[PDB]
Design an enzyme around this catalytic site. Structure first.
Site, short mmCIF file in Angstrom:
data_model
loop_
_atom_site.label_atom_id
_atom_site.label_comp_id
_atom_site.label_asym_id
_atom_site.label_seq_id
_atom_site.Cartn_x
_atom_site.Cartn_y
_atom_site.Cartn_z
N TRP A 68 1.00 -1.26 0.08
CA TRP A 68 -0.16 -0.05 0.01
C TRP A 68 0.82 1.17 0.02
CZ3 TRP A 68 -1.34 4.54 1.24
CH2 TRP A 68 -2.38 5.16 1.24
N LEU A 86 -3.29 -4.84 11.99
CA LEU A 86 -3.81 -3.97 12.95
C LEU A 86 -3.92 -2.65 11.84
CD1 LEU A 86 -1.10 -4.34 15.87
CD2 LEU A 86 -3.57 -5.28 15.77
N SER A 87 -4.96 -2.63 11.47
CA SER A 87 -5.12 -1.65 10.20
C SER A 87 -5.55 -0.29 10.71
CB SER A 87 -6.03 -2.32 9.17
OG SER A 87 -6.01 -1.77 7.84
N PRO A 88 -5.06 0.72 10.17
CA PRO A 88 -5.48 2.17 10.16
C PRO A 88 -6.58 2.43 9.15
CG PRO A 88 -3.23 2.02 9.86
CD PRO A 88 -3.75 0.70 9.53
N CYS A 142 -6.40 -3.41 -2.11
CA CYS A 142 -5.99 -3.17 -0.67
C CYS A 142 -6.46 -4.54 0.22
CB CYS A 142 -6.55 -1.95 -0.10
SG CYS A 142 -6.22 -1.88 1.85
N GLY A 143 -7.74 -4.59 0.60
CA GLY A 143 -7.81 -5.41 1.79
C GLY A 143 -9.09 -4.97 2.41
N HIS A 144 -9.23 -3.69 2.84
CA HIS A 144 -10.52 -2.99 3.23
C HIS A 144 -11.12 -2.10 2.06
CE1 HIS A 144 -8.63 -4.50 6.81
NE2 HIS A 144 -7.84 -3.57 6.73
#
Ligand SMILES: [Mg+2]
Ligand SMILES: [Mg+2]
Ligand SMILES: [Mg+2]
Lengths: 535, 544, 541
Positions: A102, A422-424, A209-211
């Site tokens: 990212w 531990l995503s922001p 991304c993932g989210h």
């Protein structure tokens, strides 16, 4: 016109190497590592000239480091490093280091063209970012060793030691193409200082991304083959490189093929025989409202939902008991193909219950897919033989879900190391109070998440810091620097404020004098340097 | 077949057309103070058949006009050293120009990935590549923001603030990384990769120091002029209004590569004692007999005292002072009025006058005081720097003197000194973190220091290493918290502050240009697509 | 804290730009170019700062060059250039220039790690190779202009002119990922001097050379979207970049999805209801630790009776209880055929009407283990895809396994029937044995003959590789045998006799050009002149 060779010594050396590999593979490191090829197969792929990549030592360091953490039920926690400054300061506090795809998309593409997290930068982008940090680590290690060894033993013991050489785990996205790509990508990662790399069961060039939303998965087997390919590469070029397997199946709603029996449970289809091909219906209308109409009419669900529905609203005597016959045999983890599950449904109800997942396809051709945590466990278990760490992307920082996934995986593979984002991308003050925040990592450590990382922390710390200072700078000039940065640097330990020393000036003045026979007129840290203002 | 034919008449016509276009270009107000030593003919001959327009040149224009207005208003374009796309994206809110630092590039951005202190011994393309890094980010975020705006209504646009991402970049060219042909090629790259302006220093290459390191070697005034000419030659050929900044390190420097240039002679240190022999060779003979270390430095310190090192005018003054001369004060002034820092008087000429005034050939030998590498000894200060400032000014849109402290008096001395001879010359000032700033100045003065220098005509000022240090603080601090208090550190130290301070990046999917790219995706897929990145499901609905 | 703006001038400039784009698109260059987005859509994607990429001028030069060739029914013929030396010498003889992905794989990857033609080098590899040549072209153009303009008019007219600036067409492989990738890849190509790029309807994870085996295709629409994406990129960043569409469907045997109706005719399936999933059957045999395995496949395939659905319909009618058989095939074939775009549901429906069977057909069961569907293309499939791509593509290109004139005519005729003004391109591949495939009299005229059919651009993909490979191997051999005599004899004398410019290599490399720059900056004169008295190129006069 050519070169002669001893054919006997050839075979002898081949055999020697095959044995060396077999011995290598028997080491404790590979205790849980499934290989589907022989040591013969690998030796044949190697060349006549053995090469030892130092990255492999950092792989070892990483494995032992994680072993101890697993045994103590505690966590190697880190975040996404941007640049040499980050790793140099991080090394004081943290024991591993994450290189984020990212962040690379926005800050470190090799074409210099930035983007959102789509893994559509050139392939060598993250491998180059590791070398960026790798070489910085190596440099500062080299700088610090000289500083120490030009002190006395008395003085050494006073001055603290930094372990700059923290192992790096780097984003390989989805591998950036086929199997041959992944080999070449892994080769680069090994050559450029990767202790471990992670890789995700998404389709390439729909890579999110993932989210982000609209995530497309690949068949379980396809992503296994990816992990095998990494291992094949590491085996050939001789690294104990750690492999991390990621699944995006918590949230994903699409998949490229139905080919793999394990996926079938989760593939969504139409229960209504009357519904025709949505894709083609849209195409004829285009040459929305019509979609939302077709979907309601089509009655989309998973096949087992359809079987349960038939039994529930059906002329059947012992209904609760008849679901359980089906659910005990057919469920997320049960790997039951669709043909097999239909066959059982026929035995239990006497219908060919209608189910068509072709008609629900997206226009691109993807099949519809309903994962959640249990799907992710299914895929976790499948990857575990091939992967030193397992990782499930989640839409929130939910403890329950993390436990569900950990418990689910460890039930079948109890010694499997887990990793957690531990995503922001989460709002963290909205998702939980601060008392829970403080202990969240530790708690996940208990469940066996031995490696945890904030993916985007480097981005955000820098972003805050630069925006804040730029604002001050604009308002009150050089006072902002004295006040916001440089004083704080002095008052906190921060080594960089003496930036000539930090950057390795006294190290290089060493090299300069050494080459010039002991003395030189152009010494960089001689009398005159303006770092006597920091004593 | 074997070659291509051409109209010879149209060739000449196009040549002449171009020569005229260049002459017209050069006559624009931009070049009003810009000395060129070649003809438009000379330049046109160097160009190819295919004209290329580098967008960097537009940022040069933007920079020049921006600095014009600042000069007129006696106010400052103040900035600092940007590290990466994140920096430029956030800086653009507050600042109006942008510095790319060679020092920072050495530590963080070398193209070999091998870091260093500020020695300009990374590969040549390192800073040019760093500009493109930022350039392309600027261009990208400009592109992202334009789409965001133009998919709003006119009503909605006017509510949402505008960021000018396209702040002009001024980049470190160090000493040019080699000869004249190098500098041309280096400038070409800078132009191609988005440089509005570049700066360049009168140090020798491969002894290149930071400004506040020691043991700095200078080059002859003319040599560095030729460097600036070479930049201009490159910019002229490839057609940029690229700004050129000339830096001098002569405030603090103590060495120089040659004596060839008459302007330097005043400042070249030599031995007044005939008995002193070649220091270099004396050390060599002592070393070859295995004298080393501090006993060797004893022999130097002895030779130096015996040699009586000084500047030639100090030597002339000394002769007159301790001499059988009637009217001494008046006799120094005859010499000092003719021979001084700014007076450009060669050594032969200054000796000739000293002979007329005293009747001695006053002895002076600067060969013997040479360092082992061959450098001549040199005593610059602010006045030397003014001398070199004036010399560079014709060739340079900005002038810049490295200083060991943030001293107002000295800055005034240099500004006054230069403007006396070239009153319309723009100046630039290093606001260096190599200074301790709370030791050097109280905070009341700190706040106004930039403004005050603005009055003296320092129209461009930069903190060279601010990007390094802000990042260094931020990451060290968070890493510390992170290690102590886990995820609470992130909620508390970073992400909450990001929300409260309005920092755009905390919504990082949007900031990174996801909604921009979803645009491109839908557009290509005929309006609609199943794999939309910011569709229902994205976890940035947690930031509304 | 921010910058203010005139909101009215914003809209005005937006509208100004929209109009500029509309005018641009109406130029004769875009006469055959389908766009599925508006000028509004594109303007919104652009930034506040317009940038003019010189590559676009070479696009224009290429288009006009090809226009004239099409009109004269003659060919722009070229080959795959390796390096600055190639383009500098090629420019004397040829009028365009090919940058090969195959060659880049072996010689020019940006990771320096070579490979066979799998497009698994990093994405920026070929774009970087173009810039390699682009910048060389520009440099030698610059060198030559100085040489000329320091001569007299009298002397100029004697000395020949080389057009170094030959337009470059470069391999984009399959686009190296999704749509966003292809945009970014195209952006680079434009920035680095590409006049045109070509792109193929293969899947990326599996990309083969054209004359390798096991080629997987993508759905027709998917590759159209690729071409659109190129165009979108070129539109945003403002190049008249030419787009070439390649199809590998002549030879390909696999495809990633069945989603696209146009493909259905060509998707192979099992006619035998009893045949189960081959993929899963192999998996079950493998997991029990079973050439004996390939036996099980070869058995299953025979039993499964694999064919195309129309073959299956024709077979039913032929061996069936039907009165008027020849006439009943023609009812089906006239409605359902390679070019007819008839979906499978539709073709089954018709077969039912014509025979009264649901003729059994299962293409799921014949899938490969990776999930690919089986596929039987040939030249007619390629025509189908040619026609489909033509709206989106300035040139069309069908990979062939041999240099067969008949086939080339079949494909040209087939495409031009539906799109008669479509430019075609042909691979003159060294993957063919050329002395085996035809005699030398035909060889000489082969390009010209294809020119008549409308193949306006033709290239030998690997010629640069092979000329160099021969030359270096041969000299190395001589060198090893008879020392420096080999160089005098094999290289340097021939260089002089053939007039090759590089033998005077100081001049060729641009020494006298740079001495110019040196003297100019040093006020007319300099002690360190590179071609002054002493240079050893007075031995070549
Ligand atoms: Mg990532
Ligand atoms: Mg610097
Ligand atoms: Mg190719």
């Amino acid at each position: 016109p050519y070169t002669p060779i001893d054919i006997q010594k050839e075979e002898a050396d081949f055999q020697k190497e095959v044995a060396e590999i077999k011995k290598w593979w028997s080491e404790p490191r590979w205790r849980k590592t499934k290989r589907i090829y022989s040591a013969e197969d690998i030796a044949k792929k190697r060349g006549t000239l053995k090469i030892n990549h130092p990255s492999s030592q950092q792989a070892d360091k990483l494995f032992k480091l994680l072993e101890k953490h697993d045994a103590d039920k505690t966590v190697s926690f880190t975040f996404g490093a941007l640049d040499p400054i980050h790793v140099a300061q991080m090394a004081k506090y943290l024991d591993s280091i994450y290189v984020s795809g990212w962040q690379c998309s926005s800050t470190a593409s090799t074409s210099n063209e930035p983007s959102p997290d789509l893994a559509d930068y050139p392939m060598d982008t993250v491998p180059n970012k590791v070398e960026h940090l790798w070489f910085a680590q190596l440099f500062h290690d080299r700088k610090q060793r000289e500083e120490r060894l030009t002190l006395s033993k008395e003085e050494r013991a006073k001055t603290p030691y930094i372990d700059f050489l923290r192992p790096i785990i780097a984003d390989a996205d989805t591998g950036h193409g086929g199997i041959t790509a992944i080999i070449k990508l892994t080769k680069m990662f090994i050559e450029r200082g990767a202790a471990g790399i992670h890789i995700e069961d998404q389709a390439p060039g729909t890579k999110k991304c993932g989210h982000m939303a609209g995530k497309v998965l690949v068949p379980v087997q396809e992503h296994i083959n990816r992990l095998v390919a990494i291992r094949a590469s590491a085996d050939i070029f001789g690294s104990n490189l750690l492999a991390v397997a990621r699944t995006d199946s918590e949230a994903a709603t699409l998949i490229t093929s139905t080919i793999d029996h394990r996926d079938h449970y989760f593939i969504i289809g139409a229960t209504n025989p009357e519904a025709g091909d949505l894709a083609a219906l849209m195409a004829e209308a285009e040459s929305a409202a019509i979609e939302s109409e077709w979907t309601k009419k089509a009655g989309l669900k998973l096949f087992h939902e359809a079987v349960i529905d038939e039994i529930k609203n059906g002329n059947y005597s012992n209904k609760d008991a008849l679901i359980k016959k089906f659910t005990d045999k057919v469920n997320p983890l049960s790997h039951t193909s669709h043909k097999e599950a239909k066959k059982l449904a026929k035995e239990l109800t006497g219908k060919d219950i209608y189910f068509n997942w072709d008609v629900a396809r997206a226009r691109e051709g993807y099949y519809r897919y309903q994962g959640g945590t249990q799907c992710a466990v299914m895929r976790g278990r499948a990857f575990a033989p091939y992967a030193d760490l397992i990782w499930m992307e989640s839409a929130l920082p939910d403890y329950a879900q993390a436990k569900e996934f950990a418990d689910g995986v460890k039930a079948a593979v109890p010694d499997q190391w887990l990793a957690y984002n531990l995503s922001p991308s989460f709002n963290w003050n909205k998702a939980m109070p601060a008392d829970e925040q403080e202990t969240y990592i530790k708690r996940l450590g208990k469940l066996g998440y031995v490696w945890q990382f904030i993916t985007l922390a480097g981005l955000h710390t820098t972003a805050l810091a630069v925006d804040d200072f730029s604002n001050q700078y604009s308002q009150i000039g050089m006072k902002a620097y004295g006040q916001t940065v440089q004083q704080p640097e002095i008052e906190k330990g921060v080594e960089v404020v003496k930036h000539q020393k930090w950057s390795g000036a006294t190290y290089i003045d060493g090299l300069l004098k050494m080459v010039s026979g002991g003395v030189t007129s152009t010494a960089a840290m001689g009398q005159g340097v303006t770092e006597d203002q920091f004593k």
